[PDB]
Amino acid sequence: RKCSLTGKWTNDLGSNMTIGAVNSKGEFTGTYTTAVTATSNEIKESPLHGTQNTINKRTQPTFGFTVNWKFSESTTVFTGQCFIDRNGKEVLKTMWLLRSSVNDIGDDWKATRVGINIFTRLR
Amino acid sequence: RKCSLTGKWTNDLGSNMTIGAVNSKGEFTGTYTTAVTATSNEIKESPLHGTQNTINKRTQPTFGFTVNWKFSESTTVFTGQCFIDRNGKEVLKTMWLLRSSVNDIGDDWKATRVGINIFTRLRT
Amino acid sequence: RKCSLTGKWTNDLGSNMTIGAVNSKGEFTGTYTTAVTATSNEIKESPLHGTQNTINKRTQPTFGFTVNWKFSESTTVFTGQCFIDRNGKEVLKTMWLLRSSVNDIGDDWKATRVGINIFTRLRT
Amino acid sequence: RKCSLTGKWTNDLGSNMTIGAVNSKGEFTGTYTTAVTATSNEIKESPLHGTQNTINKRTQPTFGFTVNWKFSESTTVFTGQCFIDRNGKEVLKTMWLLRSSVNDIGDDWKATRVGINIFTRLR
Ligand SMILES: *[C@@H]1O[C@H](CO)[C@@H](O)[C@H](O)[C@H]1NC(C)=O
Numbered sequence: 241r242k243c244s245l246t247g248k249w250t251n252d253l254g255s256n257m258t259i260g261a262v263n264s265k266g267e268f269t270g271t272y273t274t275a276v277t278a279t280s281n282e283i284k285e286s287p288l289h290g291t292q293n294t295i296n297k298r299t300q301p302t303f304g305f306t307v308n309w310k311f312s313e314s315t316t317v318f319t320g321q322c323f324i325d326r327n328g329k330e331v332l333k334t335m336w337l338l339r340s341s342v343n344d345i346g347d348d349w350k351a352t353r354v355g356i357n358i359f360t361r362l363r
Numbered sequence: 364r365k366c367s368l369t370g371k372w373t374n375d376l377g378s379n380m381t382i383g384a385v386n387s388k389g390e391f392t393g394t395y396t397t398a399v400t401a402t403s404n405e406i407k408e409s410p411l412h413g414t415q416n417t418i419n420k421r422t423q424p425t426f427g428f429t430v431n432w433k434f435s436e437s438t439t440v441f442t443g444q445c446f447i448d449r450n451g452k453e454v455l456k457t458m459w460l461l462r463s464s465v466n467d468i469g470d471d472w473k474a475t476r477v478g479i480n481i482f483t484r485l486r487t
Numbered sequence: 488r489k490c491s492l493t494g495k496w497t498n499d500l501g502s503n504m505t506i507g508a509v510n511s512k513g514e515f516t517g518t519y520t521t522a523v524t525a526t527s528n529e530i531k532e533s534p535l536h537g538t539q540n541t542i543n544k545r546t547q548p549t550f551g552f553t554v555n556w557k558f559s560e561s562t563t564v565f566t567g568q569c570f571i572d573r574n575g576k577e578v579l580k581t582m583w584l585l586r587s588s589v590n591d592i593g594d595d596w597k598a599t600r601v602g603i604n605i606f607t608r609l610r611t
Numbered sequence: 612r613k614c615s616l617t618g619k620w621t622n623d624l625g626s627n628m629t630i631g632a633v634n635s636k637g638e639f640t641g642t643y644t645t646a647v648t649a650t651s652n653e654i655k656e657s658p659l660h661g662t663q664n665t666i667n668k669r670t671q672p673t674f675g676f677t678v679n680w681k682f683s684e685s686t687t688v689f690t691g692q693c694f695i696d697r698n699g700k701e702v703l704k705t706m707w708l709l710r711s712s713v714n715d716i717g718d719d720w721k722a723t724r725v726g727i728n729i730f731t732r733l734r
């Protein structure tokens with residue numbers, strides 16, 4: 241079976257994301273939903289856009305996407321691979337770069353954070 | 364006067380990219396012609412897709428994009444900020460993650476490279 | 488009651504490391520026995536050397552260390568923080584860069600992998 | 612000729628570092644000097660400790676080091692390779708991870724920044 245990006249996902253920090261159909265070029269869009277208090281009610285939703293690599297039509301493709309945050313001046317990109325895990329579940333293993341806005345090119349060196357996220361299906 | 368992603372850029376490793384118009388949502392597409400590759404595969408031009416953050420209509424906005432490589436199974440994402448020094452020169456300062464495809468989730472841990480690229484506008 | 492790096496740890500990929508006493512400068516040495524490698528080389532135990540930040544004598548201090556691999560030409564650095572949940576469990580949350588050796592500076596751009604590891608105390 | 616870590620270096624942001632002799636195990640110590648105003652007088656000096664890989668005694672070894680900052684609770688690690696550049700000069704091409712202290716394990720996801728530094732000899 242193929243690991244497919246389309247559907248609803250949640251990650252190891254409680255964020256959720258929904259990705260729509262992936263077209264013939266590999267392109268998808270979706271929404272990324274995050275709480276703005278850890279274990280609390282305030283929820284904000286931002287669009288994401290990206291692609292799945294379709295070379296050799298792998299059953300476990302790599303992909304990447306950009307989340308265009310609507311509640312700050314930052315941007316995050318995620319890249320990873322859609323696996324069928326050893327337990328037979330679909331999992332997206334991703335790493336990300338979070339770019340903050342700085343005012344002066346002299347502060348550019350501290351504007352990028354890095355981390356991972358693992359997503360599994362919300363069914 | 365605002366740093367705009369539209370147009371033609373080159374980086375410190377000799378790669379080029381072109382980016383078309385940015386829509387009012389911040390979305391753009393482009394093409395990336397890479398000078399370097401991790402595979403021994405023949406390189407080719409590959410599409411990219413991304414967004415520029417439009418919050419507070421910054422003069423120097425953050426942005427990100429995904430390069431959907433067409434000559435391998437990998438994906439790279441870039442993110443950075445468009446800077447504009449006063450005389451008027453624009454620079455894109457970016458960082459990227461290059462994701463390779465691995466056959467087994469056991470190898471996932473070594474599938475992600477990181478680095479930087481600085482882009483400047485392709486000379487007239 | 489403070490999160491201390493001294494002792495024996497294991498990570499989410501099955502690797503182990505031992506770390507000896509932390510001196511009053513924050514310096515420690517250890518050994519790292521890796522479960523995984525990017526090369527197809529036979530793994531072996533490798534020394535590590537690092538420091539824990541002693542500013543404000545934090546209960547949960549940041550730290551970093553370098554693993555000087557003995558079965559390849561690579562180096563990996565880890566950095567992270569020692570957390571201690573109230574019942575008393577310690578966790579090291581780290582990120583690392585794995586540097587491969589390349590023969591030509593032209594290839595430097597693809598020589599650095601990044602990822603995470605979470606370590607917990609090796610079970611009695 | 613060998614690229615050797617020992618000596619004084621400066622980087623693309625104006626920081627300086629001095630690394631002592633590298634012993635038979637690959638170990639070195641040194642000092643990392645940084646300004647706490649960009650283009651200004653206030654200078655702070657922190658120790659660094661690390662190793663150079665000595666497998667196959669390469670003329671261009673990889674290495675890594677940790678800077679134990681003495682003016683904050685953060686730590687940085689650098690890793691890279693000592694090259695003889697195409698112009699015949701020694702250059703250290705490095706990337707680093709800067710770990711900030713957070714109070715709550717729930718904020719751990721944003722505590723790591725990433726960037727590069729290129730060092731050349733101050734002679
Ligand atoms: C980039 O464009 C320049 C200027 O036209 C060209 O000379 C060079 O070959 C191009 N590099 C690539 C990788 O296409």
Ligand SMILES: *[C@@H]1O[C@H](CO)[C@@H](O)[C@H](O)[C@H]1NC(C)=O
Pocket residue numbers: 497501502503520521522609
């Ligand atoms: C780690 O230590 C555990 C517990 O002793 C042992 O079972 C396992 O084989 C070790 N893993 C490695 C990579 O040495």
